[PDB]
User: Fold this.
Amino acid sequence: SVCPMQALRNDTSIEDKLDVCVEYSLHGITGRGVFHNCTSVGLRNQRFVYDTFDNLVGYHSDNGNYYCVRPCVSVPVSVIYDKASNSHATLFGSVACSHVTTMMSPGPLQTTVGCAMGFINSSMVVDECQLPLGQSLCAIPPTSDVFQIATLNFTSPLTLAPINSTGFVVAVPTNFTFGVTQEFIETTIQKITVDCKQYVCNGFKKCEDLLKEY
Amino acid sequence: GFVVAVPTNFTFGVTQEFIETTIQKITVDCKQYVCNGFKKCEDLLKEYGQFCSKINQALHGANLRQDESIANLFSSIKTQNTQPLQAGLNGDFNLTMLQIPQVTTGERKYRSTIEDLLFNKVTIADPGYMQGYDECMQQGPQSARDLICAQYVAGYKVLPPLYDPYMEAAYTSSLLGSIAGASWTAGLSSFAAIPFAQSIFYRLNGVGITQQVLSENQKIIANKFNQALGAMQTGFTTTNLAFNKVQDAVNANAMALSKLAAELSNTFGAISSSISDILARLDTVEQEAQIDRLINGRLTSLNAFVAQQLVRTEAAARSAQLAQDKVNECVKSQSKRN
Amino acid sequence: AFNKVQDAVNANAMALSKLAAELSNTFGAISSSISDILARLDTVEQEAQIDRLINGRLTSLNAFVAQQLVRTEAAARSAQLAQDKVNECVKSQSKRN
Amino acid sequence: DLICAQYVAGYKVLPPLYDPYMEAAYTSSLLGSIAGASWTAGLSSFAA
Amino acid sequence: IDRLINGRLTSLNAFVAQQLVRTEAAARSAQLAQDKVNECVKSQSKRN
Amino acid sequence: GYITKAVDCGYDDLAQLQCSYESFEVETGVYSVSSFEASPRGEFIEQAT
Amino acid sequence: TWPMPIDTSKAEGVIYPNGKSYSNITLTYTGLYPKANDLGKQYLFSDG
Ligand SMILES: *[C@@H]1O[C@H](CO)[C@@H](O[C@@H]2O[C@H](CO)[C@@H](O)[C@H](O)[C@H]2NC(C)=O)[C@H](O)[C@H]1NC(C)=O
Ligand SMILES: *[C@@H]1O[C@H](CO)[C@@H](O[C@@H]2O[C@H](CO)[C@@H](O)[C@H](O)[C@H]2NC(C)=O)[C@H](O)[C@H]1NC(C)=O
Ligand SMILES: *[C@@H]1O[C@H](CO)[C@@H](O[C@@H]2O[C@H](CO)[C@@H](O)[C@H](O)[C@H]2NC(C)=O)[C@H](O)[C@H]1NC(C)=O
Ligand SMILES: *[C@@H]1O[C@H](CO)[C@@H](O)[C@H](O)[C@H]1NC(C)=O
Ligand SMILES: *[C@@H]1O[C@H](CO)[C@@H](O)[C@H](O)[C@H]1NC(C)=O
Ligand SMILES: *[C@@H]1O[C@H](CO)[C@@H](O)[C@H](O)[C@H]1NC(C)=O
Ligand SMILES: *[C@@H]1O[C@H](CO)[C@@H](O)[C@H](O)[C@H]1NC(C)=O
Ligand SMILES: *[C@@H]1O[C@H](CO)[C@@H](O)[C@H](O)[C@H]1NC(C)=O
Assistant:
């Protein structure tokens, strides 16, 4: 690079601050990202490695090591809210609970969809859910002190087995009720017309004279 | 009289069909998608926060409607009726391809053999629902396992499906066990437990084959059935329409995420698509007019993505209703529709 | 079925909400109000400021028209499904399980 | 009534997969499949 | 010139998005047309 | 015209959901909220002689 | 008088981009390059 002398800062190291978001100034190239020690790819005299979008993806360092470079990333967060109890809980999706404790600034519970906060392990089994978490997990609101994790699980009820004879077995009803299934079919939407000149210019003759072109 | 061409020899043939029931569920962190960190972009973006809210609310509503549709499809397990099938052959009909392999090892398999054959012919990127963030933090050669790490950089999230593989396996075992018997007669209220072979021979008797023909040709019919069932993996090629529809669905899911990630390299007429280079090369007055181009272009791109996902969700919910009709009229009964 | 009724009502109302909210989009100008632009700038800056609002609002009205077409064609398909249900479930006894 | 705007604007209308002879073959197959064609329970015989 | 470029590219994106929706709708009604051929032309339907 | 109640939007994740919906009352459900920000810490700098 | 045309399948006579490197990818690049299958001009030298 070519640099003015007033922009020269001294020097630092990366080996004590790996896998965090830092700022970098590497031989004139500046930016922001996450550095990870890696196995060497690309040509080491060109010193920088790019991708097809011309973003920096790797760096051959003066200390002899190659580093993979990523942009700065973020943990995804989900809030579980129940209006009747006015209660909430948290899920960090795709995060293992051993890493929530390090970047932290009932305990954290690992689930198949991530690390849950404010939940207790339970053995409850339901077949109907109003707060589904995915992968057959269901959140049960307090009425306890915290939300519970239960599983959606059900199977087919009665298994009549064939008899070893010359006839067969049939289950014939001896009592009944009438059930009602309800159903809704849409036939229509609401019909809208738009006044285009009123929507764009709102009165105002100077906008309308500019809008005559359109 | 008249002349009629009556069969003297036959085979069994298999038609294959694919029906889509679901798309991949996406949420977007709008502020991180538009401003990528960078407080000065966010200070400019505070004038547009009401438009960032509408995107999140529209996607929330679409994902909720898909969850309701899929729970209504799976509703029929809790009430059906079921007959237990033999492992291996049932009479002389061999059903091994459609059954889950009972293994003595330490793994609980949930797929049948023909399902494993179908799943080994499609390529799907693994979203990593449990610990995908920590596995994307230690990449190196990123294309070793097919992960979606663009989630955590660009600012979107793939949501897991409502049911786990155990429950889907339970649904298709319910469908398989509801085939023999299952309201033998007029109504739908009785459940007769007649075995599988007798059920097949009554279905053949009802289409024009008399009991003399069925008694004289028992092993021949069973051998032709086993021979047709043994050749179903031949249909898993790109000349077959159903296999092309399976691959078409996988590609539409991949195409939505590619088109999301690529719009972060549009300059929209700025000097760069990177916010850091704009902040390093211009002064404050020029910075503002350069960054608001990227803000307005990215917000318009998110609006187009939301409008695409709404129409895809509505299409998938109509075809889930069609799949329910197919299960009720072809798997669980004999249709009178030619 | 009740959730579907409420969904159709919310879809009609959300279309009108998204129509009205776009008139407060500045589209990168100093204001969403034309009155304020005409009060704070001279003619050469007024033209470049009003052209942003014009181009933004025309693009928004195009997106609205594209969404109404899709919704109208979907409603016309489900009216055909409704006629099938009236003919086969209410007016006779179907043989479709 | 030619679409000459194809060659100015930069788009191409593509031809359909079948020519009119094949479409006439389809609807003549349909007209000839009406009389008879398994007037009984199943679908596998053909009465003329 | 970059105003025209960004505008015309956004317009082409809208054209592509409308073409995908019309192609999917025509594919659904081709399946409906097949059902009408099979149940009304080639047979005698028992559906009121 | 008086202010009867407030919510600090940066206090926790439910406050941030209530601020994004612009409402003190929200429905039952599961919601994705805005992620945990990076805020970069250090500096790498390397250069030549 | 051996003809020696340019073979782009071996990337003959290609200038590498300056200041950077790529690894295990495929992209397009605008620059100054020789034509494919260009014979060029031959220069034959001899002792006196
Ligand atoms: C069918 O089920 C109904 C409902 O349980 C039975 O009606 C009950 O009859 C007993 C004795 O007659 C009464 O004590 C209950 O109060 C009735 N229940 C209700 C809800 O009214 C009926 O007896 C059953 N019939 C048969 C033949 O099983
Ligand atoms: C019906 O067709 C099958 C198939 O051609 C006939 O099976 C063949 O039988 C001959 C002699 O029995 C064998 O050599 C062939 O190998 C068989 N073919 C196959 C594919 O297995 C069968 O014989 C025919 N039935 C009648 C009554 O003619
Ligand atoms: C029922 O069908 C299965 C699958 O077609 C048969 O299993 C195959 O048997 C052959 C040789 O016996 C092996 O080469 C295959 O690897 C087997 N496949 C599987 C999935 O096990 C099975 O033998 C048939 N049953 C009977 C009784 O013949
Ligand atoms: C970084 O990686 C290189 C090669 O992969 C290795 O030699 C070096 O020891 C690593 N650094 C540390 C601190 O382990
Ligand atoms: C939750 O409970 C199950 C069984 O009840 C157990 O296998 C699992 O380890 C528990 N998990 C935690 C985090 O306590
Ligand atoms: C669901 O219940 C059945 C009952 O036996 C059990 O075997 C199965 O493991 C359960 N599945 C889950 C995911 O809890
Ligand atoms: C029928 O099966 C049972 C097994 O439960 C067996 O005890 C009985 O002997 C069988 N009947 C005949 C005729 O083999
Ligand atoms: C290079 O890319 C290809 C993709 O076609 C991949 O299969 C291969 O493993 C990559 N090589 C290395 C060393 O990562």
Remarks:
- The interface with chain A takes residues 1-2, 4-5, 8, 11-12, 15-16, 19, 23, 34-35, 38, 46-47, 50-51, 53-54, 57-58, 61, 64, 68, 71-72, 75, 78-79, 81-82, 85 of chain C (CB under 8 Å).
- The pocket of ligand 1 is lined by residues A 174-175 (CB under 6 Å).
- The helical segments of chain C are 2-21, 34-40, 43-90.
- Chain C has three helices and no strands.
